[PDB]
Amino acid sequence: KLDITTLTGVPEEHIKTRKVRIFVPARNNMQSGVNNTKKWKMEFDTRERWENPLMGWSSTADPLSNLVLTFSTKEDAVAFAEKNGWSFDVEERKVPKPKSKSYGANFSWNKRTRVSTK
Amino acid sequence: LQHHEYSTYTFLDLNVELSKFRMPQPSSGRQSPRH
Amino acid sequence: DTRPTIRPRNDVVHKQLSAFGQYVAEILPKYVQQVQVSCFNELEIFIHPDGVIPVLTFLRDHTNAQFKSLADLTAVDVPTRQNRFEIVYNL
Amino acid sequence: GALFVHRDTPENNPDTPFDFTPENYKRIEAIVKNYPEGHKAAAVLPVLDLAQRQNGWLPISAMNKVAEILQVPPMRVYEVATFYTMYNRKPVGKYHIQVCTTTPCMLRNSDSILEAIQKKLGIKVGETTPDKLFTLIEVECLGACVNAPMVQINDNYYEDLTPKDIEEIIDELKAGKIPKPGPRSGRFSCEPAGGLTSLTEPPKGPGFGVQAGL
Amino acid sequence: PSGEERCIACKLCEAVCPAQAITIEAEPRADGSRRTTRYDIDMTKCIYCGFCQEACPVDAIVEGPNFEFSTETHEELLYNKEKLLNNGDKWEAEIAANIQADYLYR
Amino acid sequence: DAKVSPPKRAEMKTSMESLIHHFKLYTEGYQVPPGATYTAIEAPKGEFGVYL
Amino acid sequence: NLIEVFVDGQSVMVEPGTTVLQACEKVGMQIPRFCYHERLSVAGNCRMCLVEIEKAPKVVAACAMPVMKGWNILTNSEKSKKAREGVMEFLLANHPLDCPICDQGGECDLQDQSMMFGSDRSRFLEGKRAVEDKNIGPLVKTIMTRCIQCTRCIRFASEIAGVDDLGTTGRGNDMQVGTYIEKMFMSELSGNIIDICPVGALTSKPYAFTARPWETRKTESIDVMDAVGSNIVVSTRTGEVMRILPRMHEDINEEWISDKTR
Amino acid sequence: KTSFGSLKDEDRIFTNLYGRHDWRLKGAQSRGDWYKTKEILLKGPDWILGEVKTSGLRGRGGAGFPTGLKWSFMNKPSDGRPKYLVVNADEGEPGTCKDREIIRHDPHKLVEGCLVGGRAMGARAAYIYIRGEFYNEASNLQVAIREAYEAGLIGKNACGSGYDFDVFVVRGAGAYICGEETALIESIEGKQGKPRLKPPFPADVGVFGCPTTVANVETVAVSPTICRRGGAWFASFGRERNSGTKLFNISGHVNHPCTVEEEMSVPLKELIEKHAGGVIGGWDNLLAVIPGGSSTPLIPKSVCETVLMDFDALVQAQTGLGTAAVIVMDRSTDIVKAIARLIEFYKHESCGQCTPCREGVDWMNKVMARFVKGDARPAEIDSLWEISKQIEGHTICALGDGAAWPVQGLIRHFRPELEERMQQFALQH
Ligand SMILES: Cc1cc2nc3c(=O)[nH]c(=O)nc-3n(C[C@H](O)[C@H](O)[C@H](O)COP(=O)(O)O)c2cc1C
Ligand code: SF4
Ligand code: SF4
Ligand code: SF4
Ligand code: SF4
């Protein structure tokens, strides 16, 4: 098994305490486009983001707070997480169901699908 | 030239007189498909 | 298409590069895995990692391939592959 | 020119008094009986027409009453009332002068008729007479585009008009009279102005030209 | 000219900034308009590229003509919204004149 | 090509299509078709190349 | 039962009654659309999904037209491109220059589809229309000048919410969406009309002006307001919850969340 | 036959167009109506459909679709739902007044046509959708239908044929778009007059969600005469595939505007100069003529000189037959102003549902107004042509096509006038 953890140079705190999530990003509900929901992505766990005293900017001590790796398939992401010794959490991809849509149902004769306005 | 004997309710009054001649309407199976 | 906005495409260089790629693939079938010519007339030869020295030495010394100058040598990290590191030679 | 949003007013509010007379209710019953059961929503247009014909215009209370009677959402009745042009959502005058300004009419100098109406009534297009007797509004072809300038006052067509003829019609209306509908040039119908070029012969009669046996 | 800020908090000046020097926070003001509550640019991170003034659709953020504003402490270079507004009011006459002289090329 | 180069500010403040593209080019930018290239020029110090 | 149709020549087996848009989605082509929504009745009025069927002289509406066996759908043909450009030009002819001030900016379907399928300039030399705003409640901020009359909100109300209050008043270029009377669109699912609306006509009043989509960090979580356990996305920016958006789960909440959850 | 355009009064289907006789049941029966109607219905739907097909009848609404096959589309076994016939009496196309005369002066012919068509299509009833402005005509039609009910011609056991059939008159509300078949169906159902999207076609899903067929008043009223006198007799008039007797409305700048039932494929010049006294000022003063109402592109005097008034001949002439409404404009007419007024009509009579229609019709209206003022540039004519092409074919209803076609015809036949007016406006300023 690949154990490249000793070669990546990551400190121990960010190898064992981390919790990598492997998922396909959900579609932005504000848009009908689905081009972003095609590649598997890998992100770490959110950590403390305190307020900088001088300016109020959101400070952080998490070096891995902006890492978003994109993978073609779930298996590749799982393998990459196993390579670096990161506790991965895979979420199964959710694909919208095929839906039976009929424009003629808008004017049904004995059904509730009859619309009152167009 | 018989069009000047028609009042506002002439069209609707004639429709009322025809209600007896009209045969029963069909049914969709509910009072309104909203039901 | 045509008109100023589009970039003109040169078919002659495309044909020449495709022919030379076929030539290289024929000469070195032991290491050459794939040959491509991009639409902007750039030739790429894909080589099995054991073929670094043979293919480069051929492309440097062969009379029909005098790539005597190493323009660049870089790597591309694609962590979605078994061999994430992709070493690229520019001659 | 009009607004398609309703602002509550003392003369036009949801509490404005309106209700169908019992004879109008009988007419509504017949109208609903016209359409198949389960589709009584098909009567929105005729019931709104009846409400406008009774009240004169369509207050919001009239639309709400129509929706209540037909058991349809009030928004559907609002859509119907705003989509069509014959529904007056604001009070109009006693006589609703409507002039066709489409190309067929325009070619026959309908603008002369419109100018004559404006000169006589003293109100521009869209205005109402100070005595609330006449309302002027331009419209599109009213389906009699072959009969010179034509104005529709209430339910009657006045065709083959001339400025003098329109002045006379307005005078008759203001003097409490019923002007004769139809062409005002001398012709009785869409026939040619001078001399019938067709249908001069008497009708053939029943059974004429019956092919074989049928 | 009315005296009101041109900045309508579209945040694309922050989005285009290649150094991520601009920090913007906005809320619906008491009038209901789009006004920033925080507009902070650290001159200690800016690359003086101009992309901000080129992206602004209302000519609000504008790199002015001043270049001699050296400070004795690092903290003075972390500009607030108040600092920028004050700067704009001070150099407006010149900034306007420069815009008028150059806006036809933009 | 207003989908690569931003439109003029006069066009941006008068044209809906120009404002959309100006908005997108300065927030997301133009999408570049997938591929790779090595473009080199005769820089004053020699050959300067970029493998994009 | 599966009939055979072709999308750009490639064969694909689809059920009878399948629409052109679904046939193209099967192979991976997402036809541009404004009026069509998967969970609403087919309207067919935005006309953005017009595509060219091979050997046919007229462009059909992919959102409504059911496929017939043997059809070859030319998604990227010149007729389709010209139809999309013309429809986008007509949509943007009267659209207001509010992109900097529109909260839909950066996540606007009209912007992205103009960038991808529309032209790059305007031939509209006339004056744009303006629509009086309608107040429909304390949650949905309405700027009706941006409405493209896609009738998504009307259909969503009338079908998913059961509230037959939204509708179109008038006709022609003067058609206006919204309640005819000054009425409040009161529903527990009213918040979703903000999401279905492609343009920034309907926007979240609490979320107004607070942030831009590209800067927000999306965290996928689960709702706890009720016992449904709806899947939501917590959009945070610089360590602060900016908004809550639904996350698609066909078996729990489909595409919607309640007003409390939102 | 070689030359057409001279119909004998014995062959005219509508023998009371001008209202010179009684329009009631007695007058209609004296003029041949309702003769052997029982036998026609007892022939069978197939026989009626065959007669309609053999007559070569095409739609008088404006589309010109083959009537026989269109009606036979409904000839299917019942699926448990009622079947209806819908008569299009909206008549909103500018210049079109033929159905008004039919309803006002020959109403019993329309009722008999409704009965025959419903028998042919197995329709339970007939909803006649008359224009809302046509109130006196609606009253006349209601009186005729009441007389038919009293005589037993319609209703239960219609004409003794054992076929149950009702005729309903539904008044309009003032929308030209309600002339569209699907929009008319929506208006009957009580919604806004917004046209549906096909498929489903009315022959499968129509009024109240039931199989339906929308047809013009003339197309329905000519059916009893076709059935009685024979399909061959009807096909004997006009060119092949353009057979029949057509009602023509001659409006605009003509000496004697009128409406006459001439034979199909009649020469336009013969039709104008014979039944209307020619153009005002002579045929040498004719600028352009719109042959089929407003939705049809205009044709100049050169085309009008030798052209036949039928579907195919006008189609070849880069226009259409439409409703056969012949609008005549003399050379004193501001043709740009007239076309702008037509585009304004289409703007004011737009459902506003489809994006191309709703936006582009108003856009073209503004552009045409600026053209009328001359306040534009010569480069904008091609832009307007492209806008019209984007509108045409990309809409739900054909009102987009009906608004693009006038602009296309004007640009094709009078572009020099537009450019000259633009030059005039430029020079003055
Ligand atoms: C904008 C528009 C207006 C129309 N107006 C009429 C009309 O006034 N009368 C009519 O018979 N058909 C009209 N039509 C055509 C109808 O849609 C339908 O095709 C016709 O009524 C049926 O003709 P047919 O059955 O005789 O073939 C109109 C179509 C459009 C698109
Ligand atoms: S300065 Fe300009 S670009 Fe930046 S947020 Fe304000 S208005 Fe937008
Ligand atoms: S000049 Fe403007 S865009 Fe450039 S780095 Fe500085 S703040 Fe950012
Ligand atoms: S809705 Fe979209 S296109 Fe319209 S102004 Fe807002 S961001 Fe721009
Ligand atoms: S308000 Fe939004 S969802 Fe409703 S019709 Fe307009 S664009 Fe569509």
Ligand code: FES
């Ligand atoms: S997506 Fe099909 S017409 Fe709008």
